[model samples]
Structure formats: structure tokens, C-alpha cells
Target: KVFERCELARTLKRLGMDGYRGISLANWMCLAKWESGYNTRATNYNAGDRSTDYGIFQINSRLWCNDGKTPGAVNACHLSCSALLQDNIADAVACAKRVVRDPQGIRAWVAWRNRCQNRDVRQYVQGCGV
Candidate 1:
């Protein structure tokens, strides 16, 4: 599912992403914009580590999820990587919340640092009624 901008903003807001770990809804929106462009089925394989990032937030199999293929992986999110690919995104949002609870906070997603960090991110939620 490729979500429209405001649609995702409202969805994430409803899922409590607006203030999860002090990260704003716009920031999450920005992260999705860069990571997967709001496409729920988006995927990227990291050949360097032989792990794949699944779904809109691109949860990784090496640590966040267990794909049963990534060697020596641990399911920190307690779910299969396939679950993150669903259009519902309830699982993905929960896992995303878990990740930021660590000391790194939202910095765990490098895309957020490069594009969303220290910038005007309000545009992501502009006119979205978030």
C-alpha cells in the first residue's frame, strides 16, 4: 500500500507515533519518505550483512526481526520479518517504538539523521491535521 502523505500522517498519529519517544509525527513521516516512500511492501537487501529490511520502516532481520535466514539474528521485536510487510503496519509501528527506546533514540535510522535531523521537518505534516 502506497499511502498518501496525510493519510500516513493521520495513521501514524492514531498509532501514537506523533510523540513516541519524543519523536514527532513529521519526523516519522520524513523517515518513511526517505526509507520506503510510504510503500508498505518496500524492501532492501543488505548484501554486506546478508540481512534484509522489510516494509515501510525497513525493519532489519539481523536484530529487529527473525527472518529465519539472517545468521545469528535475534528477534528484538518478537516477530517474523514477514509481519512487517503487511499493509496494516500495526506491527511495524510497535517495533519502531521499541527501537527508539534504546539510547540511540531515533538515530538508529541513519536516513533520519541525514535528511530529517536538524532540519525543518514540518513540511512532512503540513496540512495533514496531525
Candidate 2:
């Protein structure tokens, strides 16, 4: 489902995103803003890479998910890329946790690398009561 930024923050917190398995909710918020504009169904096709990014976290089809059309797709999350676009983000969050466990950590998200790295995003949750 579409969510306002603050609503997403609260929902993420409820889903154990706050420091869950070592992921920082603040960083996730920043990543989501830059990646999907808070829309769960968001998708982007990159011509340069011939890859598609799916869902709020912009998980890529090249490694994390399979879109059926992408040859040699890794499907590391073992889920269809379309699954990440669901209204409930449980699948997306679970897959993201897997992504975080990779060697790059949260840097697996380019948005985090570019916009949120070394910055304080605590404000993203402020007044959300999360």
C-alpha cells in the first residue's frame, strides 16, 4: 500500500526495522525516500544496466530477485521481483534483511551510499512515535 513517509516509519518500526538484525531504521528511511519515494509498488528500469529495481527498497532484479525476463538473475532472495511490490512489505523487509547481511551491508542500497551515508536520519522518525 502507498504510505506517507511518517506512516511508513511507524510501520517499519512496528515490523522490527528499528535495529532489527543490526539494520538502522533511520538509514532505511533515508534509503526508502531516495529509492522509492515511499511507494511500495515502485519500480525502475535502468537501461544502462538492463536491470529493474523493485519495491520501496529498490531491490534489484540482477541479484536479489527474479523478474522472469532477466536472464541469469540470481534470485538470491528466492522470490519473484513482483513479490516485493505487494501492499504488505513483509517480503520486502525480509529480502532486505538478506541484502544487509551481504558483505556491503546497507551499502547494498545505492541510495544509502549516496544520500544517507554518514548522515543522521533520526529526524525521519521524529514525532512518528515509533
Candidate 3:
């Protein structure tokens, strides 16, 4: 997933993030680390043991597929996304670009070691975790 998303970042670098701003490829690495812990198929198990989310962004089932009601639909979402359903890389890339479009978003992302807060990182942020 990291390699694939990095490839997408390279692709988007040419476009320069919809021409609004640029996100460093290093920032892409941070997003992948925080979002899914590089586990593209990671899912959340609720108190009832239900599959609550999936994919690199962990986009919840109700947001994109299965209504979160069908049997094993969460697994279906994961398989579909990991299999490139509806262009999973595109979704991930788009999300990464969108986030960094914010004035301080990229810096905060790259400052993960400081818990996403450092002098440079804080300068860009108007608020934490907005």
C-alpha cells in the first residue's frame, strides 16, 4: 500500500495537487503511517465485533458501500478497495492532496514524531486536529 500510494504521489506531483498547493512526498509517507498504520486492509471491530471500517483511509462502510448491514460487507469493502475498487489509489491520493491543501496541513503531518506538533508544525496549524 505504501509503495502504491507513493507511486500515486509521484503521479500527482506532476499535477501539483490541483494547482492549489503542493504536498511533499515525505508528507505522503506520514499520512500513510497515521491513517492505516500502512495496513491497507485494517478494519475496526466494534464492541459487538462488527467490521466498522476498511482500506487505507479506513473509510467507513456506510460512506461508500454495503450500508454496513450486509453480512461480511466490511470484508467486501476491504477486498474491493485493496483490489482497486473505484480507484482506491485515486481516493488515497485525492485525500492526501486535499489534506495538505490546508496552509499547515503538510507540516503537521510530517511532524508525527512530535505528536504532530513542533515549532514549524505549529506555525502552520490554526488549531490542533481541526
- Compared with the true structure, all predictions reach lDDT values of 0.92, 0.87, 0.45
Model 2 per-residue lDDT tens digits across residues 1-130: 6788789988888787888667678888998988988899899998877899999999999999999877668999999998999999989988988898877899877778889898888887788777
Point to the candidate with the largest TM-score. Answer: 1
Candidate 1 has a TM-score of 0.98
Q: Candidate 1 lDDT, tens digit per residue, 1-130?
A: 9999999999998899988888889899999999999999998999999999999998899989989989879889999999988999999999999989999998999999999999999999999887
Q: Report each candidate's C-alpha RMSD, comma-separated, in the order given.
A: 0.6, 1.2, 9.0
Task: Compose the digit string of candidate 3's lDDT tens values, residues 14-100.
Answer: 545433465444444444556566556566644563435554555445323343363455332233333322334565455445445
Q: List the residue pairs that clash in candidate 3.
A: none
Q: Could you give me the TM-score of model 3 versus the true structure?
A: 0.41
Instruction: Candidate 1: give the clashing pairs.
Output: none
Give the TM-scores of the predictions, in the order they appear: 0.98, 0.93, 0.41
Candidate 2 deviant stretches above 4 angstroms = none
Candidate 1 local lDDT, residue 107: 98
